[PDB]
Structure 1
Amino acid sequence: MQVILLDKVANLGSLGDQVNVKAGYARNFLVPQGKAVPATKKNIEFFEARRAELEAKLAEVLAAANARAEKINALETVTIASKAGDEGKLFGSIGTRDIADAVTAAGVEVAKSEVRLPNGVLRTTGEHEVSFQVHSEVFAKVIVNVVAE
């Protein structure tokens, strides 16, 4: 494919490469997510002066704004005080919805789709490490303290 790239892909993307990829990776991942534009004799002219000169640094400062969105919450901790079972065995397993609502109500305003859970649905009541996908390289180290009630 002659598809020119826009985002910093962690394998072959370095802001302006013409690396040959398959059509299924371009049509289903790069195009609908805005990651890359298929270049056929006019998008090269679009990327030549209008995109690589101005909009690449705009994407870089939007990545810096995502880093600042990570740097909104300086506490980086969430104390969940939901109802629990008798001596452990928590009542309801907390997914990404309640964690995203607790971070959005006080702290980072990131959406639910960037929230990742390394330790499952967090059935164990205690200290847990939760990372956020605010950026493809810089990750979060949120310390969630599940407290039994």
Structure 2
Amino acid sequence: MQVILLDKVANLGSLGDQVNVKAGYARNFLVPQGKAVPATKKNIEFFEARRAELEAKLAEVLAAANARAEKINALETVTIASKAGDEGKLFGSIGTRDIADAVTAAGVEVAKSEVRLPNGVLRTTGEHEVSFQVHSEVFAKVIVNVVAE
């Protein structure tokens, strides 16, 4: 038969292709342990609706889990009111829920665990930098400036 697959399936499958398999394999193994299904045409278009949706649509929505950072370099500077000891060296210090909570709390809304201040993370005043995370490949840089007020 033809049959269209479900899971990845070894030396033939893919995850949602239209392979062609010996019926002995389809009945008796694949379809029963629902790893595939009869290509009843009714189905093959059940799959064409499933060829437009999740893919074409929700990847220009991860073009929004990405263009969040088109507003990461268009400000590129938050200040933290953290002072300085005996020579312009932070009396404070700012981490991730400091650089995600002092990022969210404006027009820059990020998820608190989306702010990589590799440690410096942090131990002095003035300008620093950080690695802001929204996508797996597209993060983005800013500039942070712990203001000694």
Q: Using the TM superposition, give the Cα deviation of residue 114 of structure 1 relative to its aligned residue in structure 2, in angstroms.
A: 1.0
Q: Distance in 1 between matches of 2:124 and 2:22?
A: 43
Q: Using the TM superposition, give the Cα deviation of residue 142 of structure 1 relative to its aligned residue in structure 2, in angstroms.
A: 0.7
Q: Where in structure 1 are there 5+ consecutive unaligned residues?
A: none
Describe the superposition over 1:31-78 as per-residue Cα deviations: whole angstroms up to 9, x where unpaired: 999999999999999877526644443233233354146427721211
What secondary structure is seen at the aligned counterpart in 2 of 1:61?
Answer: coil
Figure out how many residues of one structure are paired with residues of the other and give that number. 149
Q: Using the TM superposition, give the Cα deviation of residue 83 of structure 1 relative to its aligned residue in structure 2, in angstroms.
A: 3.1
CA contact (8 A) 1:73 1:107 kept: no
Q: Distance in 1 between matches of 2:48 and 2:37?
A: 13
Q: Are the structure 2 counterparts of residues 98 and 63 from structure 1 closer, same or farther at C-alpha, using a change threshold of 3 Å?
A: same
Q: Are the structure 2 counterparts of residues 106 and 2 from structure 1 closer, same or farther at C-alpha, using a change threshold of 3 Å?
A: farther
TM superposition score normalised by structure 2: 0.57
What secondary structure is seen at the aligned counterpart in 1 of 2:44?
Answer: helix
Q: Using the TM superposition, give the Cα deviation of residue 141 of structure 1 relative to its aligned residue in structure 2, in angstroms.
A: 1.6
After the TM superposition, which residues 1-149 of structure 1 pair with which residues of structure 2 at under 5 Å, given as runs? Answer: 49-50=49-50, 53-68=53-68, 70-71=70-71, 74-149=74-149
Q: Using the TM superposition, give the Cα deviation of residue 15 of structure 1 relative to its aligned residue in structure 2, in angstroms.
A: 10
Q: Distance in 1 between matches of 2:22 and 2:127?
A: 43
CA contact (8 A) 1:63 1:135 kept: no
What secondary structure is seen at the aligned counterpart in 2 of 1:87?
Answer: coil
- Return 88-97 or 26-35, whichever deviates more: 26-35
Q: Distance in 1 between matches of 2:25 and 2:81?
A: 43
- Return 118-127 or 42-51, whichever deviates more: 42-51
Describe the superposition over 1:119-143 as per-residue Cα deviations: whole angstroms up to 9, x where unpaired: 5322121211112012222331211
CA contact (8 A) 2:88 2:125 kept: yes
Q: Are the structure 2 counterparts of residues 141 and 93 from structure 1 closer, same or farther at C-alpha, using a change threshold of 3 Å?
A: same
- Return 89-98 or 107-116, whichever deviates more: 89-98
Percent identity at matched positions? 100
Q: Where in structure 2 are there 5+ consecutive unaligned residues?
A: none
CA contact (8 A) 1:70 1:108 kept: no
CA contact (8 A) 2:69 2:140 kept: no
CA contact (8 A) 1:78 1:145 kept: yes
Q: Are the structure 2 counterparts of residues 120 and 72 from structure 1 closer, same or farther at C-alpha, using a change threshold of 3 Å?
A: closer
Q: Distance in 1 between matches of 2:18 and 2:46?
A: 15
Higher helix share: 1
